[PDB]
Amino acid sequence: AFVVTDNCIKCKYTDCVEVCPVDCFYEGPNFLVIHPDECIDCALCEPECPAQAIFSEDEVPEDMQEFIQLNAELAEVWPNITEKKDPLPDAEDWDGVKGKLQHLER
Ligand code: SF4
Numbered sequence: 750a751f752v753v754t755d756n757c758i759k760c761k762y763t764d765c766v767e768v769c770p771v772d773c774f775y776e777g778p779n780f781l782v783i784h785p786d787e788c789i790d791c792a793l794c795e796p797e798c799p800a801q802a803i804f805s806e807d808e809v810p811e812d813m814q815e816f817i818q819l820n821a822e823l824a825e826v827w828p829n830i831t832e833k834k835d836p837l838p839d840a841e842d843w844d845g846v847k848g849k850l851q852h853l854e855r
């Protein structure tokens with residue numbers, strides 16, 4: 750699996766969904782997640798994210814390890830997203846701010 754990590758939150762550009770061949774992104778109000786059993790590890794989403802928030806599971810930084818289980822959990826509960834949409838309004842303001850997990854909305 751690939752995994753969405755902290756910098757997506759309050760950015761949610763949604764560029765990643767457009768290259769996914771298996772439609773395995775699931776949508777929250779201010780974040781996306783990857784369903785790990787559906788993901789085929791094609792790696793195509795990784796370079797598309799402007800937030801650079803996506804990592805191979807085995808490359809998730811130590812300080813963002815909690816995101817691996819969090820993607821698995823939220824992928825079960827959130828609706829599928831398969832089309833690009835506008836980024837969140839103040840995305841540029843939040844891109845690169847750390848610790849945005851505190852702002853995650855269910
Ligand atoms: S690695 Fe491929 S299959 Fe997995 S989420 Fe990214 S684009 Fe979709």
Ligand code: F3S
Pocket residue numbers: 753756757758760761762763764765766780781797798799800801802803
């Ligand atoms: S910000 Fe989030 S919505 Fe996709 S393009 Fe990046 S993982």
